[PDB]
Amino acid sequence: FEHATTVPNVPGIPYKALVERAGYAPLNLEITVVSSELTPSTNKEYVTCKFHTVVPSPQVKCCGSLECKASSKADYTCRVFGGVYPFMWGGAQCFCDSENTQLSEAYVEFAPDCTIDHAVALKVHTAALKVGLRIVYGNTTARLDTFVNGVTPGSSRDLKVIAGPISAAFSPFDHKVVIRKGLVYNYDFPEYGAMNPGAFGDIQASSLDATDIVARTDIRLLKPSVKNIHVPYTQAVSGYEMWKNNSGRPLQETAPFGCKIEVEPLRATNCAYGHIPISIDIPDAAFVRSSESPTILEVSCTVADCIYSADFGGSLTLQYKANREGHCPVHSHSTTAVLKEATTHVTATGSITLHFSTSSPQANFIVSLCGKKTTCNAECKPPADHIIGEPHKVDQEFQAAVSKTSWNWLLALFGGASSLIVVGLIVLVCSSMLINTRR
């Protein structure tokens, strides 16, 4: 037998439903989302870190000239200066006070500490949401991992299920992402090759060992003024470090919907948002026909004190009369009240106490026992606490969210005006008919 439903995607909250197959006895169905994993598809644009500004040992053409070559280092920078006449600890280094050129050379490579200290730039696309479900029907309680897309079926032992598509697609990752040492950030890093000095991603490469590293750090060489040989240079600060300081908080503290971010691969677990349509083919073997199940004769509902809170702050009692000892399923046929227990051992005659939670100020909801329906009427007080360590297990609607006292006052106040305008129209019509008849 195939059943369709729409389960709220809130990990840690059972959802209960009843399947009433006409031939068979009613069966319970409680569904829990044990875990979710929203994982996107990503491609690595580049990696970046602190550049090491390496400066090759300078060469001098002692009484001649030199020309700047065209190398393929990262941010490669070469200049030639005129007569320098350098000196060393050994002493003078050349024999021409003029035309004693020097060639200044500098470029960058990855710092030796970049192996651990580096950042990866990724792009994300549409993310596919995968869910692990624990689903119980009657006694069976198998689990299963499935993809929530509306197409791919999550075949289990025999329980077949299709889920989705998600009611509202959502992705915590913006279009561009950066992942550094576990932490995730949403930074619109500049594209590959578009290095700008002094900002994030000033040096980029396809991989740590890749030799085609490209960078633009605005390095510039100056004329050596002191007569000791040395090459001076000034360069913008490492934009990688600038970003590290101005990073802001990571996404583990900023992703919405209470989502716990994890890496390797990039993913978003336990993310509570939207509704998941689930269609499930429960096998008929677990079904039991009503000729063998106990059909109860008479049940009534008496509700104790109740309170509307996330916790199970409501209690009630069922006085029942049935025809056999068995395992009838109990259920709530309202969206604003959910019971705790599902199956109760039922006798020929007796009573059962149950717990429930509601969101509505009044419990005005139908309880069903093995198909027999009875209306519970109650009046739940406001909760005494202010904060709980549990999530609210049931949504709060509008219709069953105002007490019948308020409802009666509102309906009286509106019905007064409605009846008054109706009576006024009727009076005008009647006056016209009386004038016409006695004219």
Partner: protein
């Protein structure tokens, strides 16, 4: 590496709201976020005792 564990905060509840009394001899990070459409993410380094 070992890292310290801050003094456990004292939580005072109130209607749609909480109050953390905090004590931290050294700068401790406090990070809060909502579980809805808007993160409303907040970060603050706190020293001393405050609310």
């Amino acid at each position: 590496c070992p890292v310290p564990l801050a003094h456990t905060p004292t939580v005072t509840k109130w209607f749609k709201g909480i109050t953390l009394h905090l004590t931290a001899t050294r700068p401790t990070l406090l990070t809060t976020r909502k579980l809805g459409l808007r993160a409303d993410a907040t970060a603050e380094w706190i020293t001393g005792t405050t609310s």
